[PDB]
Amino acid sequence: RYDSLLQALGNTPLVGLQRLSPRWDGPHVRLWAKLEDRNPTGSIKDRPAVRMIEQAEADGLLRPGATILEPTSGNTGISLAMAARLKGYRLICVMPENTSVERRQLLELYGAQIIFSAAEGGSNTAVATAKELAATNPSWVMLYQYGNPANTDSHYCGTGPELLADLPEITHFVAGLGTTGTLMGTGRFLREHVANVKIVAAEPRFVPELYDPEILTARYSVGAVDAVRRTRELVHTEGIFAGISTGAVLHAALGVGAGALAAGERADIALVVADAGWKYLSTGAYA
Amino acid sequence: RYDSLLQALGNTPLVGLQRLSPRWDDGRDGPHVRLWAKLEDRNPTGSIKDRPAVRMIEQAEADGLLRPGATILEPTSGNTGISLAMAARLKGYRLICVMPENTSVERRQLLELYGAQIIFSTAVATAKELAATNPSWVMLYQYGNPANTDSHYCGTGPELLADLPEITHFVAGLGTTGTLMGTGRFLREHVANVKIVAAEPRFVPELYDPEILTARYSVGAVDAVRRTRELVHTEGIFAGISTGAVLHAALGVGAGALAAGERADIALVVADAGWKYLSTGAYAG
Numbered sequence: 001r002y003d004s005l006l007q008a009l010g011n012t013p014l015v016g017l018q019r020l021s022p023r024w025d026g027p028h029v030r031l032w033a034k035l036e037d038r039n040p041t042g043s044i045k046d047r048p049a050v051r052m053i054e055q056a057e058a059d060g061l062l063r064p065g066a067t068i069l070e071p072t073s074g075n076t077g078i079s080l081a082m083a084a085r086l087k088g089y090r091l092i093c094v095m096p097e098n099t100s101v102e103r104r105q106l107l108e109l110y111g112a113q114i115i116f117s118a119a120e121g122g123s124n125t126a127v128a129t130a131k132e133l134a135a136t137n138p139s140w141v142m143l144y145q146y147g148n149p150a151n152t153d154s155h156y157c158g159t160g161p162e163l164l165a166d167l168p169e170i171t172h173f174v175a176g177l178g179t180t181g182t183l184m185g186t187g188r189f190l191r192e193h194v195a196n197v198k199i200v201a202a203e204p205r206f207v208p209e210l211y212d213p214e215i216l217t218a219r220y221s222v223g224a225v226d227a228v229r230r231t232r233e234l235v236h237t238e239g240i241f242a243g244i245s246t247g248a249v250l251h252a253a254l255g256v257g258a259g260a261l262a263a264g265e266r267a268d269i270a271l272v273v274a275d276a277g278w279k280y281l282s283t284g285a286y287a
Numbered sequence: 288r289y290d291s292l293l294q295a296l297g298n299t300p301l302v303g304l305q306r307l308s309p310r311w312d313d314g315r316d317g318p319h320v321r322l323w324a325k326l327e328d329r330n331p332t333g334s335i336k337d338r339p340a341v342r343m344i345e346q347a348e349a350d351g352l353l354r355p356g357a358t359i360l361e362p363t364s365g366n367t368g369i370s371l372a373m374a375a376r377l378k379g380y381r382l383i384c385v386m387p388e389n390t391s392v393e394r395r396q397l398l399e400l401y402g403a404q405i406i407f408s409t410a411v412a413t414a415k416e417l418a419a420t421n422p423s424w425v426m427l428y429q430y431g432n433p434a435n436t437d438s439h440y441c442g443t444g445p446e447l448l449a450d451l452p453e454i455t456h457f458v459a460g461l462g463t464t465g466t467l468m469g470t471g472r473f474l475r476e477h478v479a480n481v482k483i484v485a486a487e488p489r490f491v492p493e494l495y496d497p498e499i500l501t502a503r504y505s506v507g508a509v510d511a512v513r514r515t516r517e518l519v520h521t522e523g524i525f526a527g528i529s530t531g532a533v534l535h536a537a538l539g540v541g542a543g544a545l546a547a548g549e550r551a552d553i554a555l556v557v558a559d560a561g562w563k564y565l566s567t568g569a570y571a572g
């Protein structure tokens with residue numbers, strides 16, 4: 001039991017995918033899904049968002065009633081909006097205008113102000129916009145998820161240890177590459193404990209300051225169509241209603257697994273389910 | 288770890304509502320009056336219905352009622368349908384849901400994604416008639432199947448007692464009545480003087496047992512929507528609309544304890560999250 005929604009975070013389930021795995025029972029090639037939608041606002045960003053705020057509190061950077069400013073494509077904004085309601089802060093998000101309606105509904109419900117940046121240039125445009133706002137009003141506190149080490153540390157101290165506890169036999173960890181915190185933190189932790197572990201990025205077909213290229217074994221770029229087809233496959237075969245990035249991660253993980261199978265090598269491949277499908281229904285991807 | 292999503296069910300968190308509670312800390316003014324929220328959206332398909340749905344299907348399988356490719360038929364307003372749709376897909380059954388026409392589009396989308404057939408409709412009568420027409424169809428029948436109540440007697444109740452052994456009250460919505468009959472019978476059988484409190488919207492399922500409830504509150508939609516919004520604003524929990532009604536009743540009970548100067552530790556169910564209700568407008572800025 002917990003005294004705050006903020007504490008009911010992490011320790012997410014790992015679920016073996018018996019049907020989707022290239023070979024569940026030569027040696028096995030298993031996929032294991034870590035369900036990060038089992039978190040306060042339904043995404044993995046609850047981990048870095050809460051740690052970034054708490055670290056800024058510890059460092060003296062946030063006084064009561066302060067205004068937080070953050071560029072986001074939705075999930076981090078939502079997690080910060082939740083935490084800001086519990087902690088008494090205001091939030092201004094800069095978010096690209098071509099994002100799902102569910103994201104803006106959630107943000108408005110939590111009381112965040114949203115500046116909708118131009119679609120052209122996507123995240124780079126949102127980040128440049130947020131930096132421009134930060135410079136016009138220095139009292140606003142930008143935690144800066146793309147450069148804040150508390151993002152990586154949330155995974156070094158949370159995601160990674162939980163994976164190793166649940167799956168000591170892990171051979172590969174597969175996740176999306178956005179802020180890079182998930183892969184940097186989880187991957188640094190796993191490399192310290194697991195001889196020979198492979199860390200694999202999925203990215204959509206600037207460089208965050210958190211990024212350390214030497215943590216990755218490989219980077220796969222995934223198209224939206226393949227991400228949609230795999231997201232659909234995951235819900236049809238395993239019942240997990242995931243967001244689109246999960247489909248891209250699964251595409252990569254299934255590539256890794258097909259390689260292991262063809263080589264006669266045992267693999268236990270952990271993959272992140274970073275959020276659920278709820279915020280993506282309006283896209284038509286699940287029709 | 289688990290090797291099926293169906294196992295990653297239950298064992299849901301209980302979260303203290305320090306801001307919404309009438310009095311979180313014992314003080315000069317009198318003893319604490321605490322609200323504790325059980326987050327049943329942390330379940331395979333995002334609602335408490337995963338508990339009875341999985342148990343009903345598994346009980347029907349153990350009893351020898353289902354064969355590969357069997358058709359299951361269920362009257363539902365959406366949550367049980369969704370739960371059954373997911374489990375039927377994994378187990379190789381066909382699902383037909385009889386639903387009222389005025390339900391949120393999100394429900395329809397999730398049912399169709401899992402591959403359920405939807406018949407619109409009264410829904411219970413329509414299902415019963417169809418089941419009679421097609422004797423090979425299996426109608427689990429959430430309004431009368433004891434595996435619904437048992438899922439709460441064996442799951443929700445003991446989990447809640449383990450996390451909150453100081454419990455004074457349990458509050459939940461009254462629909463199929465499984466949650467309150469199961470959890471309530473468990474609690475009343477274990478905890479002297481515990482209060483079992485229903486929230487109902489302003490036929491009687493066969494599962495209903497009139498001796499279990501100690502109090503029953505009718506809550507209007509306006510109050511349910513206001514409380515749902517209050518919960519997200521004050522505690523950050525993005526709940527469904529039934530949770531607002533449950534909160535309304537829980538706060539009533541809490542105000543009573545506060546006025547009487549009595550300690551209370553009131554557990555309440557958050558049966559689903561707000562996701563499926565965004566299309567209603569209930570969560571507008």
Ligand SMILES: Cc1ccc(NC(=O)Nc2cccc(C(=O)O)c2)cc1
Nearest residue numbers: 072073075076176178203204245248
């Ligand atoms: C293949 C693929 C597809 C989608 C993603 N998603 C992201 O990287 N999301 C992301 C990145 C940076 C910030 C945020 C945010 O919620 O603010 C989200 C990652 C990888």
Ligand SMILES: Cc1ccc(NC(=O)Nc2cccc(C(=O)O)c2)cc1
Nearest residue numbers: 363364366367460462487488529532
């Ligand atoms: C005050 C209040 C408001 C809403 C509820 N919700 C319900 O009872 N939901 C319900 C009832 C019966 C069947 C189903 C179903 O998912 O099929 C849902 C319960 C109480």
Ligand SMILES: *Cc1c(COP(=O)(O)O)cnc(C)c1O
Nearest residue numbers: 075176178179180181182245274
């Ligand atoms: C943030 C995010 C990612 C990428 O994770 P990072 O730790 O930012 O690299 C992938 N998928 C979803 C849904 C996300 O919100």
Ligand SMILES: *Cc1c(COP(=O)(O)O)cnc(C)c1O
Nearest residue numbers: 366460462463464465466529558
């Ligand atoms: C089913 C349900 C209820 C009522 O629970 P019962 O066990 O059917 O009485 C309340 N809220 C939600 C969201 C539900 O799906």
